[PDB]
Design a protein around this nucleic acid. Sequence first.
DNA 1: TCTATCATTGATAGG
DNA 2: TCTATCATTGATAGG
Lengths: 195, 195
Amino acid sequence: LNRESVIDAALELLNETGIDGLTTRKLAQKLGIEQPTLYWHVKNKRALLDALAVEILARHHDYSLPAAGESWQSFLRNNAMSFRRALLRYRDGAKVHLGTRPDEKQYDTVETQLRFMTENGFSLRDGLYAISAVSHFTLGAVLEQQEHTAALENLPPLLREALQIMDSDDGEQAFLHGLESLIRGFEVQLTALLQ
Amino acid sequence: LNRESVIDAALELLNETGIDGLTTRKLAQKLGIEQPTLYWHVKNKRALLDALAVEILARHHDYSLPAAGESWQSFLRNNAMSFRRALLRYRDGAKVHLGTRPDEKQYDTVETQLRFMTENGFSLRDGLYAISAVSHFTLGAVLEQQEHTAALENLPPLLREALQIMDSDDGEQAFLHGLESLIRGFEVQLTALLQ
DNA sequence: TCTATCATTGATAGG
DNA sequence: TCTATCATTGATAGG
């Protein structure tokens, strides 16, 4: 019963009780074992949470790299949609992710993304900023959609209808809309530099 | 020694020990009082954290509303910069904010922002989506800048220089750059509808 | 606004 | 991979 099987029952426990009901003792009982034994498998809870973050991405975030011949617009779009989709598969996934320090084992993936931007028109900073903007927006978005989904009158007109809209989707179209907003903003800034 | 003075020593304790060292017992000692007395002033810790969130914004986020005759571009820009600047004044400010449910006492401010968009070209959803995108990006950005600032080799070329860039600013220019990226994306989508 | 007094929870000794 | 055994910490009885 590995550390691999521990990080598994942990992801099941995340989807059950959320990031706060995910307590050492509940995990042990899931693994049929006794509490301080988990300390054999994991350094500590923080270590365990970083584990889950990496695990989620590795497990669902397939589109980390640009396909051959793909436009930056299409990459950024595809990457962000894969990113968000990974976070959304687990309860509190975005929060769990936010706590983790960036993974050293993906240094190569990161650098390839950077290079890809320089080759499609961007200087280094503009590619950095472009990629950063996209993941910041995507993060903020999933965090909110997830906090809205969870949480377990006399609203003014516009607001009333507005909540009804986000309520419809969960935020999907809102997200897809802000994504394109960023890309079009990147296009217009690029053709403004070439100009 | 009010609940007003409690929420004060609490903001001082946030800037000292961060969102995690902010423990009931440390707060009491700051207030020269004994622990369970704080329970007279505050319902519970969550209630206290929402208190701090509202307090931070009320205290620094002045630009919540558009000035008379201001362009949407200028509002969104000014609002986001004020928002981020408020979060940045307190350690873990963005995290503290993220936990809070939206304030009922700002229903009027929200609705005025919505109306302002319909009057400057946007339908309801597009104004909603535009305003949402801006605060999602701003949130994701401050959250990261704050986690990067806190936390208390053989990096590949591009990445090495990239970290050096974000390290220079703390993320400021990165932020200001993504902000304009969103706005220009909004402009181009608006003139694409009128078209 | 103080006094016990808890219950939950992450973690280490110790083998 | 189990046995005490803690220390930190949020919270309620009870007046």
